[PDB]
């Protein structure tokens, strides 16, 4: 790596520049596979542009668009063209990550199932692995290039690998060919932006000077509370970064410091504790003390993993974790952004975007005692000459939930001066922190110091207007130098409020002090208006940016300081437009709230919220006060109880009639798979056949040497699997399952048989994904789904012969569904005939009445082990065109119950995997979209009984939450195909 390629994206120790600008790259983590409704793009890019964010990072999946070897497939709700069309209608940029490894907690770290299939290391430069990956990189980076901001796009920097950081005893690590090969695949195919990488730690690999292999910008990632969410109020000693500014110093001066991926959440596994304590551990006062914590190291590309998390729908995600995504993410899993931790990232957004002069000062190391008496606390400067300083102020102890009093003194351009001026005490209270500045330019104003926090500002047709924030009873100074110009006539007026102090110096600096609360002040100085609020006023200020011209208008006027209107009140802003005389404002309301608009544009003289005018109160600051129309309904949803359910058999193989032939042979004598050499006569690995995906079926033949016989049975499902064995018709044992088991050895008795008679075993082995591949060297994405050894033996010791058959999804890597794609369907008999489809044939299922004996309702389940499917009609009729409403399928989970596992279905689309006994997920959203809101959908339910006394739902019921009164735009439904009978099928 030798610098820039292009002139339009380039980069310095300071920052990135973009179209010549420097900017604060503030970006947000989104995953276009976990949100399969293409027209739902532009509401998550509004919420993530409205935090103040200019940059979204996104993976791509491997394993969804290359099934079949050699068959790239990304179209339908595959395609990205309706991802990258939204990022620039929201004027919102992106950093584009496809792998080929992205390890994201998704099925094989992104590989597909066939690598299993290939002799060599994984992520080493062995040929038939490298091979293996050209076809994927040719077409996936020809469409990213299509994208990129030098062709009129939104695409701005590329990652090739994921976190390649270190390897397992006796591998080459780092390996400069293999590096390199993987550059040159994305040079290639046309990626010309600048290349960046995310290292674990500071190691230094693949930096600049580095040689073979190396990148143009180095990056790294930080986790610093881990993955463990069973303590939520708990901070670790030592558990706060204090060295990233020496190391970043050490490994990489010349480009800017990078955290590509940095802690917004954590991940959850099956038994785990529920994203709801992972947005307790990590929340509002994680955010204020860890980010401004990287903001003292002077951090200027910045993304938060994950900002929304969506779902691992159609089997798409690991066995370390379930169905939902939602991370205890700021935008959760459902779209809403009701979490506290949400307008707190709002507020860090919408302060960097305006504040240039950060990106040039130079942070230095952290001090205590320095710039305050106090040692109770620690300060870090950032300091320049003379466009400004900040100042990080925490507790000594970085996790105290005590509350400190101190006065700081800090260099200013009138000399150092010890704060507040006029008397009194500043107040850190606890888990929080807080950046005081310097010098700090508002326009044509300067503001000699502030304690308080800044939110925005911005120069208007009639005055500047500058809007300052503090916790509540903290008492807070400011000074400004000469406001007033040439006029020794001129005084300060108070506008609103009663608590405010205003002294003026002789030289005509204006010092001011208040004390946050609900009552907002407001000082007129000249044509300088401050607003003086507390932090939960400022939590509902928005900053809409004004549009420009073309196709790139949503990216308005310039990056930093932009074009704008002020708007005090609403659940979310999303845009505002002029036409003609009139302010146009799209905006989303969960509670009634007047609005107020700050910074009206000269001529404009009529408001429409929504499409519809109204009338509004002039202030004698000339600001408007709106009321409108805020009704928020009581919505009624059908009861599932309710719905006229139909029944079918989903494992027809243990009936005496049952034929087989159609099934593929397990006759591989031999197998590729380097990791788990074979212990069998021939291969049982759910890969070495094409299947991937969900439950698996074996079926294995032998002959009667002795009436009784004992079977050893080893099997291997993922973490958190179960399976089940027959003989003929008769049930003979479940493993049950638990999260720390990943594979099973049981024995079992069969007795009563006839000497001489042949007898089938069938065995169902679920998996819950293949594994991830995160250490290189240890080929560990290649554990097997399966049966990994067996053996039967007659009572007096001789071995007897077993031959066999399997099963997973229809056609394996020749997949029935197009649309829905490769990882949708796993093996049970009601997925391979495609009965979880919308109108499926009810003449094959039955109807019978609920609580009797013939009951086709999963409310009363089944007597015995075994499984079946449930379909239903639910019809929808809700007010969607007005009104944004969440809608989720809760099972009901009562402790004293028989153990079973449940798959959802919603119109063919699989959104959840149900574990009675290991948990913790109960309740299970799906998206507006995926459902109609206004016309038929099919719902579905397969049950799996594990042990002899069978099982049955509890209960189960459909949800809402709150309506929000919306202004989005028109979210279409998912077209997917209905039931049609499939040839050959089985
Ligand atoms: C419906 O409602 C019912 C209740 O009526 C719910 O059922 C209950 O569900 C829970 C949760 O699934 C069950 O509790 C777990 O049981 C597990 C199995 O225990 C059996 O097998 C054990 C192993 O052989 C055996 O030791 C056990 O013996 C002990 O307990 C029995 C009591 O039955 C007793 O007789 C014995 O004397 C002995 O004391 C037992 O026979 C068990 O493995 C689980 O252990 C974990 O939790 C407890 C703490 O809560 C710990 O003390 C353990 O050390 C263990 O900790 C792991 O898991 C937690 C939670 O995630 C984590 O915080 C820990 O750090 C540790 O993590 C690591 O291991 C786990 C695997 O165990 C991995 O997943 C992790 O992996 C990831 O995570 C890391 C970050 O954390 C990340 O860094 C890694 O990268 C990543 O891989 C870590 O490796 C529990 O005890 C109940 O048994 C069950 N109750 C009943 C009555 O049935 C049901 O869930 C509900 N359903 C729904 C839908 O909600
Ligand atoms: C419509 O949409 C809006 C958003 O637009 C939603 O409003 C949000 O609703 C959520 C859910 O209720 C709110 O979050 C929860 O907030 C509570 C209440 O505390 C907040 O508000 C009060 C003012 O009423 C503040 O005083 C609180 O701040 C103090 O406490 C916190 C510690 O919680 C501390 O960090 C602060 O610095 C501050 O401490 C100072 O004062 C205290 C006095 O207590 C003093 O002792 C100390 O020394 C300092 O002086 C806070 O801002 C809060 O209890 C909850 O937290 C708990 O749970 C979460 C997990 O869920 C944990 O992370 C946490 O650790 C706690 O255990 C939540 O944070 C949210 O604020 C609110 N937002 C807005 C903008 O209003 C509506 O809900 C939506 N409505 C519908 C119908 O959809
Ligand atoms: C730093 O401050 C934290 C939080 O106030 C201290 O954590 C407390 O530690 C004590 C004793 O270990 C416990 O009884 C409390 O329950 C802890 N509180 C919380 C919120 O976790 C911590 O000990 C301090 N650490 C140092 C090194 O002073
Ligand atoms: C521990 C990190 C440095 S690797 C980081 O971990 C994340 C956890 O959610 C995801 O798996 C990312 O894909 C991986 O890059
Ligand atoms: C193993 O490797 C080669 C790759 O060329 C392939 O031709 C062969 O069919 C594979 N064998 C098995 C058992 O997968
Ligand atoms: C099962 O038994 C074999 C010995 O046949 C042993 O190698 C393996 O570790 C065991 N697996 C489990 C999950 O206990």
Redesign the pocket.
């Known amino acids: 790596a030798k610098g820039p390629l292009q002139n339009i994206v380039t980069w310095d120790e300071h920052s990135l520049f973009v179209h010549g600008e420097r900017v604060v790259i503030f970006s947000g983590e989104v995953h276009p596979f976990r949100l399969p409704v293409p027209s739902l793009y532009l509401d998550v890019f509004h919420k993530i542009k409205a935090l103040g964010f200019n940059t979204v990072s996104f993976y791509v999946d491997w394993a969804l668009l290359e099934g079949k070897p050699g068959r790239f497939r990304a179209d339908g709700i595959f395609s990205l063209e309706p991802f990258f069309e939204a990022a620039t209608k929201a004027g919102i940029y992106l950093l584009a990550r496809p792998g080929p490894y992205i390890n994201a907690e998704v099925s094989g770290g992104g590989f597909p199932g066939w690598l299993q299939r290939v002799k060599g290391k994984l992520r080493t430069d062995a040929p038939d692995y490298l091979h293996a990956t050209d076809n994927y990189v040719a077409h996936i980076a020809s469409i990213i290039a299509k994208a990129q901001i030098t062709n009129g796009g939104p695409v701005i920097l590329y990652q090739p690998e994921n976190e390649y950081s270190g390897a397992a005893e006796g591998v080459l690590f780092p390996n400069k060919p293999y590096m390199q090969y993987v550059i040159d695949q994305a040079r290639n195919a046309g990626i010309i932006v600048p290349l960046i990488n995310n290292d674990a730690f500071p190691g230094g690999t693949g930096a600049p000077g580095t040689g073979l292999g190396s990148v143009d910008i180095y990056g790294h990632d930080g986790y610093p509370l ?3 969410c ?1 303590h939520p109020s708990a901070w670790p000693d030592n558990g706060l970064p204090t060295t990233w500014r020496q190391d970043h110093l050490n490994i990489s001066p010349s480009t800017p410091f990078s955290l590509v991926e940095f802690q917004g959440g954590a991940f959850d ?1 099956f ?3 529920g994203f709801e304590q992972c947005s307790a551990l990590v929340n509002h006062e994680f955010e204020r003390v860890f980010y401004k914590n990287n903001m003292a190291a002077g951090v200027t590309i910045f993304n938060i993993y994950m900002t929304f998390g969506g779902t691992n729908w159609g089997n798409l995600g690991h066995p ?1 974790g379930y169905t939902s995504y939602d991370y205890g993410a700021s935008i959760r899993e459902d779209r809403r952004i009701d979490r506290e931790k949400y307008s707190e990232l709002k507020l860090q957004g919408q302060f960097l975007k305006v504040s240039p002069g950060y990106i040039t000062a130079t942070p230095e190391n952290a001090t205590q005692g320095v710039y305050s008496d106090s040692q109770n606390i620690v300060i870090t400067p950032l300091l320049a000459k003379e466009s400004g300083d900040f100042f990080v102020v925490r507790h000594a102890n970085y996790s105290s939930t005590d509350t400190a009093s101190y006065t700081v003194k800090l260099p200013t351009s009138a000399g150092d001066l010890t704060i507040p001026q006029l008397g009194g005490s500043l107040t850190l209270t606890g888990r929080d922190s807080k950046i005081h500045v310097t010098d700090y330019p508002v326009g044509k104003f300067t503001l000699l110091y502030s304690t308080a926090e800044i939110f925005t500002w911005n120069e208007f047709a009639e005055k500047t207007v500058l809007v300052l924030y503090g916790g509540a009873q903290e008492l807070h100074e400011f000074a400004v130098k000469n406001p007033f110009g040439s006029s020794k006539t001129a005084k300060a007026k108070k506008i609103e409020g009663s608590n405010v102090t205003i002294h003026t110096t002789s030289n005509l600096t204006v010092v001011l002090q208040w004390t946050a609360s609900s009552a907002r002040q407001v000082v007129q100085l000249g044509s300088l208006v401050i607003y003086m609020v507390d932090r939960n006023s400022a939590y509902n200020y928005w900053v809409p940016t004004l549009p420009g011209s073309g196709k790139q208008s949503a990216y308005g006027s310039s990056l930093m300081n932009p074009d704008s209107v002020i708007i005090n009140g609403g659940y979310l802003i999303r845009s505002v437009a002029i036409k003609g005389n009139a302010l146009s404002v799209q905006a989303d309301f969960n509670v009634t709230t007047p609005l107020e608009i700050i910074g009206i544009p000269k001529g404009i003289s009529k408001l429409a919220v929504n499409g519809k005018e109204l009338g509004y109160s002039v202030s004698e600051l000339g600001d408007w006060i709106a009321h409108p129309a805020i009704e928020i309904p009581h919505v009624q949803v059908p009861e599932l109880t309710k719905l006229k359910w139909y029944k079918v058999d989903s494992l027809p193989e243990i009936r005496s009639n049952y034929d087989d032939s159609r099934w593929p042979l397990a006759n591989l004598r031999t197998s590729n798979n380097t990791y788990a050499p074979l212990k069998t006569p021939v291969s049982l690995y759910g890969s070495d056949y094409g299947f991937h995906a969900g439950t698996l079926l074996f079926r294995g033949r032998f002959t009667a040497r002795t009436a009784r016989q004992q079977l050893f049975l080893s099997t291997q499902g993922g ?1 958190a699997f179960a399976s089940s064995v027959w003989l003929n018709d008769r049930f003979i044992g479940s493993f049950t399952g ?3 088991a990943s594979a099973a050895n049981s024995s079992y008795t069969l007795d009563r048989l006839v000497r001489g008679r042949r007898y089938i075993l069938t065995v169902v082995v679920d998996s819950t994904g293949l594994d991830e591949n995160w250490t290189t060297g240890d080929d560990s994405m290649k554990a097997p789904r399966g049966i990994l050894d067996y053996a039967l033996t007659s009572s007096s010791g001789a071995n007897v012969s077993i031959s066999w058959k399997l099963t997973g999804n229809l056609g394996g890597e020749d997949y029935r569904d197009v649309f829905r794609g490769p990882l949708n369907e796993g093996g049970l008999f009601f997925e391979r005939q495609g009965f979880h489809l919308p109108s499926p044939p009810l003449s094959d299922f039955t109807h019978g009445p609920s609580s009797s004996s013939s009951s086709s309702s999963p409310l009363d389940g089944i007597a015995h082990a075994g499984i079946a499917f449930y379909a239903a009609k639910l019809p929808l009729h809700l007010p969607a065109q007005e009104y944004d409403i969440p809608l989720s399928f809760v099972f009901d ?1 009562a ?1 004293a119950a028989a153990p079973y596992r449940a798959l959802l279905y919603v119109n063919g689309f699989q959104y959840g995997k ?9 309740e299970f959203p799906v998206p507006e979209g995926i459902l109609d809101y206004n016309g038929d959908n099919w719902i579905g339910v397969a049950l799996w009984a594990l042990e002899s006394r069978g099982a049955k739902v509890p209960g189960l019921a459909l949800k809402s939450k709150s309506p929000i009164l919306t202004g989005r735009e028109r979210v279409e439904v998912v077209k997917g195909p209905h039931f049609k009978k499939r040839h050959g099928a089985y």
């Open positions: 881990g993955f463990d069973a596994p038994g785990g504790w370390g973490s638990f999260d720390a989970n402790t149900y574990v009675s006994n290991i948990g913790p997920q109960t």
